[PDB]
Amino acid sequence: IEEIDAEKTVLEKSKAGAKSRFDNYSKLYDEDVNAGERQALDMRIASQS
Amino acid sequence: ITSGLKGLHMAAAALEMVPNIYGFAVGGTRYGAIANAIAIGGGIAAEG
Numbered sequence: 001i002e003e004i005d006a007e008k009t010v011l012e013k014s015k016a017g018a019k020s021r022f023d024n025y026s027k028l029y030d031e032d033v034n035a036g037e038r039q040a041l042d043m044r045i046a047s048q049s
Numbered sequence: 050i051t052s053g054l055k056g057l058h059m060a061a062a063a064l065e066m067v068p069n070i071y072g073f074a075v076g077g078t079r080y081g082a083i084a085n086a087i088a089i090g091g092g093i094a095a096e097g
Contacts, residue, residue: 047095
């Protein structure tokens with residue numbers, strides 16, 4: 001039974017790692033473009049104008 | 050170093066207005082040095 005509790009601990013660790021990946025990719029997905037990237041699109045269209 | 054270098058072109062454009070052929074033939078100056086300098090400045094701003 002002590003072994004099976006240690007296995008619950010290792011699944012806690014893997015769960016925390018996958019949760020960190022999920023939150024970090026969701027953050028970089030929803031913040032889709034930066035400020036400076038939009039500034040680059042501004043400079044190109046200023047050159048076109 | 051692109052510096053607003055169009056000022057440095059406009060220095061030459063302003064410096065070339067005066068007629069240089071003297072004597073009998075009078076004139077000979079360019080007239081379109083100004084707009085040519087404004088043109089090369091408009092190019093150099095886009096490159097910057």
